[PDB]
Amino acid sequence: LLQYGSFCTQLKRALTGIAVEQDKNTQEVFAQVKQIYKTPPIKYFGGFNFSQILPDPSKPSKRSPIEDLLFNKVTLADAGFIKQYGDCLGDIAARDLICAQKFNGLTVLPPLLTDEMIAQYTSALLAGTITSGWTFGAGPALQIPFPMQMAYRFNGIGVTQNVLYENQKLIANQFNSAIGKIQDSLSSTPSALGKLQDVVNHNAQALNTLVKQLSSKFGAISSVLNDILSRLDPPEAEVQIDRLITGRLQSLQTYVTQQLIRAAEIRASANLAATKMSECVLGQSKRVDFCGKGYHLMS
Amino acid sequence: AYRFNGIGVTQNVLYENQKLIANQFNSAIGKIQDSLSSTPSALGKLQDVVNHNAQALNTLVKQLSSKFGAISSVLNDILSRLDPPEAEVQIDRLITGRLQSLQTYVTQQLIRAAEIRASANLAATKMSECVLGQSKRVDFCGKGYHLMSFPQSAPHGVVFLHVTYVPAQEKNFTTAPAICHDGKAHFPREGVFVSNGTHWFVTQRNFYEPQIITTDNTFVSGNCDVVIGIVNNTVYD
Amino acid sequence: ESNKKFLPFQQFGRDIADTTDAVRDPQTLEILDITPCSFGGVSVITPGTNTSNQVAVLYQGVNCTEVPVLTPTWRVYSTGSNVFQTRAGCLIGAEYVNNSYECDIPIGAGICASYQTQSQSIIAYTMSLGAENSVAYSNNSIAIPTNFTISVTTEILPVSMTKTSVDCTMYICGDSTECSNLLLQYGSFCTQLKRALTGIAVEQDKNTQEVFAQVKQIYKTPPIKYFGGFNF
Ligand SMILES: *[C@@H]1O[C@H](CO)[C@@H](O[C@@H]2O[C@H](CO)[C@@H](O)[C@H](O)[C@H]2NC(C)=O)[C@H](O)[C@H]1NC(C)=O
Ligand SMILES: *[C@@H]1O[C@H](CO)[C@@H](O[C@@H]2O[C@H](CO)[C@@H](O)[C@H](O)[C@H]2NC(C)=O)[C@H](O)[C@H]1NC(C)=O
Ligand SMILES: *[C@@H]1O[C@H](CO)[C@@H](O[C@@H]2O[C@H](CO)[C@@H](O)[C@H](O)[C@H]2NC(C)=O)[C@H](O)[C@H]1NC(C)=O
Ligand SMILES: *[C@@H]1O[C@H](CO)[C@@H](O[C@@H]2O[C@H](CO)[C@@H](O)[C@H](O)[C@H]2NC(C)=O)[C@H](O)[C@H]1NC(C)=O
Ligand SMILES: *[C@@H]1O[C@H](CO)[C@@H](O)[C@H](O)[C@H]1NC(C)=O
Ligand SMILES: *[C@@H]1O[C@H](CO)[C@@H](O)[C@H](O)[C@H]1NC(C)=O
Ligand SMILES: *[C@@H]1O[C@H](CO)[C@@H](O)[C@H](O)[C@H]1NC(C)=O
Ligand SMILES: *[C@@H]1O[C@H](CO)[C@@H](O)[C@H](O)[C@H]1NC(C)=O
Ligand SMILES: *[C@@H]1O[C@H](CO)[C@@H](O)[C@H](O)[C@H]1NC(C)=O
Ligand SMILES: *[C@@H]1O[C@H](CO)[C@@H](O)[C@H](O)[C@H]1NC(C)=O
Numbered sequence A: 001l002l003q004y005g006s007f008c009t010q011l012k013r014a015l016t017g018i019a020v021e022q023d024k025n026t027q028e029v030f031a032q033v034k035q036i037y038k039t040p041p042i043k044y045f046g047g048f049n050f051s052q053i054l055p056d057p058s059k060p061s062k063r064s065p066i067e068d069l070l071f072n073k074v075t076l077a078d079a080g081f082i083k084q085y086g087d088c089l090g091d092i093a094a095r096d097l098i099c100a101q102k103f104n105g106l107t108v109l110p111p112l113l114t115d116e117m118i119a120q121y122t123s124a125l126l127a128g129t130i131t132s133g134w135t136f137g138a139g140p141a142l143q144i145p146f147p148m149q150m151a152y153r154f155n156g157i158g159v160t161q162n163v164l165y166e167n168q169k170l171i172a173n174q175f176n177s178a179i180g181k182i183q184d185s186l187s188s189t190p191s192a193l194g195k196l197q198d199v200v201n202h203n204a205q206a207l208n209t210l211v212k213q214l215s216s217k218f219g220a221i222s223s224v225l226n227d228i229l230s231r232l233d234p235p236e237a238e239v240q241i242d243r244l245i246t247g248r249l250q251s252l253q254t255y256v257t258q259q260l261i262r263a264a265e266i267r268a269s270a271n272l273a274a275t276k277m278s279e280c281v282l283g284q285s286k287r288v289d290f291c292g293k294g295y296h297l298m299s
Numbered sequence B: 001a002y003r004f005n006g007i008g009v010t011q012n013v014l015y016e017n018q019k020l021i022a023n024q025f026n027s028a029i030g031k032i033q034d035s036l037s038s039t040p041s042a043l044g045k046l047q048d049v050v051n052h053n054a055q056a057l058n059t060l061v062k063q064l065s066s067k068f069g070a071i072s073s074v075l076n077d078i079l080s081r082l083d084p085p086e087a088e089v090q091i092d093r094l095i096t097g098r099l100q101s102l103q104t105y106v107t108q109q110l111i112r113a114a115e116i117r118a119s120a121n122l123a124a125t126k127m128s129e130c131v132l133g134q135s136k137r138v139d140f141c142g143k144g145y146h147l148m149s150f151p152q153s154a155p156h157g158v159v160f161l162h163v164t165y166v167p168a169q170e171k172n173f174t175t176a177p178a179i180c181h182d183g184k185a186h187f188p189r190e191g192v193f194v195s196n197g198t199h200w201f202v203t204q205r206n207f208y209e210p211q212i213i214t215t216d217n218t219f220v221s222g223n224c225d226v227v228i229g230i231v232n233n234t235v236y237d
Numbered sequence C: 001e002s003n004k005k006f007l008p009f010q011q012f013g014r015d016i017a018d019t020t021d022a023v024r025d026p027q028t029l030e031i032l033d034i035t036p037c038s039f040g041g042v043s044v045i046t047p048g049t050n051t052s053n054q055v056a057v058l059y060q061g062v063n064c065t066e067v068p069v070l071t072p073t074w075r076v077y078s079t080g081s082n083v084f085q086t087r088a089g090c091l092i093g094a095e096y097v098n099n100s101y102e103c104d105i106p107i108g109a110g111i112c113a114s115y116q117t118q119s120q121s122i123i124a125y126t127m128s129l130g131a132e133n134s135v136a137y138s139n140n141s142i143a144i145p146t147n148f149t150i151s152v153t154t155e156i157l158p159v160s161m162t163k164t165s166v167d168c169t170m171y172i173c174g175d176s177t178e179c180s181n182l183l184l185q186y187g188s189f190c191t192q193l194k195r196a197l198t199g200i201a202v203e204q205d206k207n208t209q210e211v212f213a214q215v216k217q218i219y220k221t222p223p224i225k226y227f228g229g230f231n232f
Helices: A007-030 A065-073 A084-089 A097-102 A115-132 A146-156 A161-165 A168-188 A194-215 A225-231 A234-281 B002-006 B011-015 B018-038 B044-065 B075-081 B084-131 C168-173 C177-183 C189-212
Strands: B145-154 B157-174 B179-181 B184-188 B192-195 B200-203 C022-024 C031-033 C041-045 C056-060 C083-086 C089-092 C111-116 C121-126 C141-158
Touching: A007 A115, A007 A234, A065 A115, A065 A168, A084 A097, A097 A194, A146 A161, A161 A168, A161 B184, A194 A234, A225 A234, A234 B084, B002 B011, B002 B145, B011 B018, B018 B157, B018 C141, B044 B084, B044 C141, B075 B084, B084 B145, B084 B157, B084 C141, B084 C168, B084 C177, B084 C189, B157 B192, B192 C141, C168 C177, C168 C189
Parallel strands: none
Antiparallel strands: B145 B157, B157 C141, B179 B184, B192 B200, C022 C031, C041 C056, C056 C089, C083 C089, C111 C121
């Protein structure tokens, strides 16, 4: 193989580029603000109830109930684990596909940002948008009572503020009911989180195909190098080894190309998500059907 | 003044602070050259394209020294050291290897071209929206309230200079949603009620400028029994 | 020793990748299982060579106990120097501290490394998300600014790249005729390559034209440059 060029340097470079791009995407999406705001201890906002989206201090990981349901709904499977070789050598007689992947030179790297840091970023964004409206997204944060912020947002869509000031309780009740229905709507439908499951399914399928490809003969007497080496003299052995080498190289090339295309698609999706975070959360958008159906109020 | 009215600030603010705004703009423009020159890694995106192209071409050239399983990597030596019928089988390996290298190079170039096209489309949209007009989209033409943009050309790229407005030196105040007077509720037209401790005024949101509460800048539209937190005072006519 | 329940007529065991992992000893009929011995990857963390020559070594995905200390001939200290365990594996040659700074060199799950004067040394820490803040929220209080600042920022965007062309015959066969004749019967791959390269070359110019040709009138500035005190 040493005399076939430098294809594998190119493969390593492409894989490293994709790995760096993933962390860049996450950092771009989830790091809009540089100040870690925290909610006031007393939770009274004119009748609006935010308990379903604020972090829960009772649980150890400090996640909102909706975040808990979202994390329980999706199966993660592959992740980074230290001493994973020890678990593989434990040999409980249940040889999973992960150990087979590891023993053939395929590894999975952990992300730079943990889940707790992302949860902290989300909590800071929520506290900022609750306590300051949209001022913290364009300079220093300026406090303002929540009903006055809602009156400003209603003026933003062409409705006078006395409409809000005379229907505060009904609007608060409607908002509370709409927030409450979200958990039931998410839990009842099992196919809601298809997009997030598709990524895991695609990665697992690609890795499994790459591992299974090692059993092909590609026109040789056998698919095992040791058997070929023991059953033949060398000069008849190079011609048998060459076919296997070429087949495995082709499989690696195909895998890398597919990974590159998927990475490009994921980058486009991440850019869209970052734009939506910038425009719908840190301010009020006048673009039609960009931040929901109807006249956008807040995200 | 038109651009300041576009972000919700009255034009008399500009007309009374023209010299200070001009000085601030001049200083901000002057700092740009020092900021660009001091940092050596600012123009990484433009250098990456050249580096990638040079690396790809160098790899393609260096790939010609591989044997790919033949006796030699030189066609003339193979032709001179062997009869033809033994020579086609040696030439075929080299041909296949070089073809594979060309295929890989072309595929990588296509992917890079797609990425560059996406970047160029984004740049064209930014040029259309931030330079030829004033944008209300948050964080699209800089950080803060966008005022105006200027374009510049660079090797294989464009550089946008965004000029924006940032508030500073905030102060605390006591506020109320409405004012009760003669059994009627009054709401501000454009602004918010503010109290310095003793008296009440109305001011615009993005700049402190108190004014006497009159019937000219308020409307009634309701009674004084529904609004929560109403405060009763006097309204001048 | 293997716990697999081999049938009396079975002599070998295979896996998904078609590799033998269970064997029966020819002399004593006992079932044994085979596992490859330890292996892994090594990463090197270093600042620029213009600064120092000290390095740190990260063994990836390996519990730092039963450390290999081998295929690599060079030996790290493996002792004396600080040894730390991260979710990415083991780190050797860097000291862990309580202080949190901005990330300099990424390592793994929330762990970064830096070169600090402390005697210069390499330290590892947990990255900091940002400075703490807490706005005073009240339901009858507001905050209003009293001054402003004019800010100028920059943004850089690539537009086009290099246009290249390749000749198949000269690259593959040079000036030889036998090689050209042999290549003539391999199809029309090179026509496709030429078409793709030409398409990319045209697309580059299209991108530049789309970006830089918004207006069709060539305006020029007046000779006298006075714009109310603004300096351009
Ligand atoms: C905000 O909503 C939550 C849940 O929607 C309320 O918590 C409920 O409180 C009642 C009475 O204390 C309990 O019987 C329920 O079991 C609680 N539900 C949950 C999920 O904890 C909370 O009381 C609401 N906020 C206010 C101020 O009433
Ligand atoms: C709040 O604003 C009112 C309105 O200007 C201030 O009242 C004035 O105070 C100055 C100096 O104290 C007097 O010269 C004026 O005659 C007052 N105006 C009126 C209509 O009486 C008041 O002092 C301000 N309070 C604070 C704490 O700043
Ligand atoms: C608003 O900010 C500007 C700039 O920070 C202030 O102008 C400065 O005023 C001080 C006080 O004399 C001068 O020493 C500086 O030279 C001024 N800066 C410039 C650029 O001219 C201005 O005073 C502030 N306004 C208020 C009401 O505080
Ligand atoms: C606009 O700015 C430029 C540079 O910032 C000014 O040019 C400077 O003028 C002074 C006095 O004539 C010279 O001492 C400097 O050497 C000049 N700098 C440069 C880079 O040429 C220019 O004067 C300013 N415009 C006005 C109308 O004052
Ligand atoms: C406004 O009040 C808060 C708390 O009451 C305080 O932290 C802040 O410094 C005050 N701002 C000014 C400008 O006095
Ligand atoms: C003015 O407001 C106070 C506080 O709400 C209230 O007690 C008082 O009755 C009001 N004045 C009149 C004339 O109703
Ligand atoms: C093979 O011979 C050895 C003696 O060296 C003996 O211990 C063993 O039981 C024999 N096994 C069989 C299957 O005959
Ligand atoms: C490393 O190995 C030891 C011994 O088996 C084990 O006790 C320890 O838990 C392992 N480290 C981790 C992080 O699990
Ligand atoms: C870091 O902080 C923890 C807090 O409990 C402390 O136990 C530990 O000793 C500190 N690190 C060092 C090196 O002292
Ligand atoms: C909100 O207003 C109510 C008036 O009913 C008051 O009792 C409460 O203290 C206010 N909240 C805060 C945080 O001061």
